[PDB]
Each structure stands twice: as structure tokens, then as C-alpha cells.
Structure 1
């Protein structure tokens, strides 16, 4: 409804809440779609850029919670090529490190990257849950490994 009223910022806040809850609720694909909508709505605005910097990260995290590392890499590349601020942001490096760790299936490397990211930028419970599910998915792959 806020979008129908063209209140971009209020719709963006509502969509942030919706995507956060959906990702926490097991609906990673829908949360990533809402994050894509947020990215598209906030693109070109000098006012919401950090939100974007986080958006990309979050979206990728959701795509990585869904075991879709290719989609996470595509999102990282899109953010790097579209937003110069995100390209040099720590969030981009952290997302790339997470994508690489999932590609190599090194859960310990993912944990090390998470600790490094926390040391400079504190993680939130949403990210904690996403990465916990991701690590448990690596463990499940280890179960499929047998």
C-alpha cells in the first residue's frame, strides 16, 4: 500500500521487516526477492546507499541459506558492477569469502570469516541465524557425503 502511495521509504521499511521475518521463517527465496525489490527501489538514491550495501549482503546470505551459491555469486557481481560503494565495501568482501567457503565446503573457514567480519562490524541475530543454518547445511552435506 505504501508503494501504491509512492512512499518509497515507508514501503522500503515494511519490506525490510517482511524480508527479515521471512528469512528467519525459512523462506529464503522470498526474502531474497524482497531484498531485490528493495535494491531496485533504493538504487540511484544517495539517501539509502548503505541500506543497499547491506541489502546486497543480506540477499546473498539468503541465497546462500537456500544452498544457491551461484545465485549468491550473481548477486555479488551485480552489486559490485552496479554500486561502486558496495564493490569496495567490507560487505562485498565478506559475501565473496562466504561464497568461496561454501564452494570449497570449508565450514571452519566460514566460521573464521564470520569472526573476522564481527571483529570490525558486529553481526546481528538475523545474520547469526542465517549463517547458523548455512553451517548446519554444510553439516547436512557432510551427512550426504556418507
Structure 2
């Protein structure tokens, strides 16, 4: 369906279908496709007067996938995203991921939990985010 819609230059429906595909692929542990789709959608939405404000969220999702693959990969991806999108350096997602990287770099689980709880207090986490966070915590 996404390919058919993109064939007719229907960007919104194709983007939504690709979002669903990337989410389901991430659920199935297929990180490469999820990160590729998230990066593509974020880059596409960065250049819009209306969707621009959402460009951050997608990046964060992609960043989370990197954490599953490795740590230094996630750090490098964060650096690349911040350089590409400077305004990403003030969003709460970047601060949370920086704190999680700092805690995870020294075998600190307590600080990990405190940061997770502090962020979740302001906003309730969904099943996808909480499951990915539990996986990352279980890693170490």
C-alpha cells in the first residue's frame, strides 16, 4: 500500500504506512529496516512548515533502536542527529538518552531507574517505549 501511494505522490499515507511497517519491524527485532524508515521519515518531515515540530520524535525512536544494536553506535547516531538538527539538542528525549548513556557506561542501574521514573512521571510511557526500555535495562 505504501508503494502504491508513493507511486501517486501521496506522501502522507505512504509515510503513515511506513511508520506502521517500521514499528512492526522493530517489534520483531528487525532494527535495520526500522532505523532506515525512521530516518527517512524524519528527514522528509524536517522540511515542512507543519510537520517540522514532530521531526524530533521520529529521530528519538530511531535512536532507541541503535541502543539495542550497540552503545557507541547510539552515541554516534545522537551526535549525527544533533549536528543535522541542532534544535534536537534542547528536547527532553536527547537529555533522557544522554542520561541513560551516562548511567549505562559505568554499570549503573540505579541512576538508570531514577531517570526512567523521572521522565515517566511527567508523561506516561507506551507499550513500545516501555518494552524497549526494559530490554535496554536487561542488557546491563
Q: Same fold (TM over 0.5)?
A: yes
Q: How does 1:1-146 map to 2 (within 5 A)?
A: 1=3, 2-66=5-69, 68-138=70-140
TM-score by length of 1: 0.83
Cα deviation 1:65-95 (Å, max 9, x = unaligned): 22x2222112222222222432211111112
Offset at residue 60 of structure 1 (A): 0.9
Runs of 5+ consecutive residues of structure 2 not aligned to the other structure: none
Offset at residue 59 of structure 1 (A): 0.8
Once superposed, what is the RMSD of the aligned Cα atoms?
A: 1.7
Residues 16 and 109 of structure 1: is their aligned pair in 2 closer, same or farther, counting only changes over 3 Å?
same
CA distance in 2, matches of 1:61, 1:86: 15
Offset at residue 118 of structure 1 (A): 0.9
Offset at residue 98 of structure 1 (A): 1.9
Runs of 5+ consecutive residues of structure 1 not aligned to the other structure: 139-146
Contact (CA 8 Å) 1:3, 1:11: kept in 2 or not?
yes
Contact (CA 8 Å) 1:57, 1:91: kept in 2 or not?
yes
CA distance in 1, matches of 2:135, 2:42: 24
Partner SS state of residue 104, structure 1: coil
Q: Which has the higher contact order (CA 8 A, sep 6+)?
A: 1
Residues 108 and 49 of structure 1: is their aligned pair in 2 closer, same or farther, counting only changes over 3 Å?
farther
Moved over 3 A (4+): none
